[PDB]
């Protein structure tokens, strides 16, 4: 941990990055974008948050991007904007041939 926490410059490509680029263009704000070592969207670990919620609560990162749901537990410590895509618990089926 004494040496530099690895700053591997990678390139990012996805839907949420495009959302971020569009909102940045519309609002004219730049961003130091980085990824968290937790690897989770965030759950209450003994009253402590991690990942997106952990970084936002401790304010090391101002905002969190990605596929983040909106639930009442998360809204306790952070606030969510109007959701842009619709998700939830859904059913996946195999196709059936004709009869």
């Amino acid at each position: 941990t004494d040496e530099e926490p690895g700053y591997i410059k990678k390139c990012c490509k996805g839907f949420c990055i495009d959302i971020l680029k569009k909102i940045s263009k519309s609002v004219k704000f730049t961003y130091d974008l980085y990824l968290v070592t937790n690897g989770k969207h965030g759950k209450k670990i003994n009253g402590t948050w991690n990942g997106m919620i952990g970084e936002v609560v401790m304010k090391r990162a101002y905002m969190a991007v990605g596929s983040l749901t909106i639930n009442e537990e998360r809204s306790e410590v952070v606030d969510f904007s109007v959701p842009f895509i619709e998700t939830g618990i859904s059913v996946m089926v195999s196709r059936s041939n004709g009869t």
Partner: protein, 49 residues
Amino acid sequence: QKCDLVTTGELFFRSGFGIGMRKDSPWKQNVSLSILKSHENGFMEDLDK
């Protein structure tokens, strides 16, 4: 209901409804919290049924 009128077209303008209310009135956060709670526990499913 009627079964002689049929819907068509892929869902464009994918959005959501919402109860709109004045900016300065304070129920907003509590209203949103209650709506999310109703979504979580299936009360909205009971309404849909």
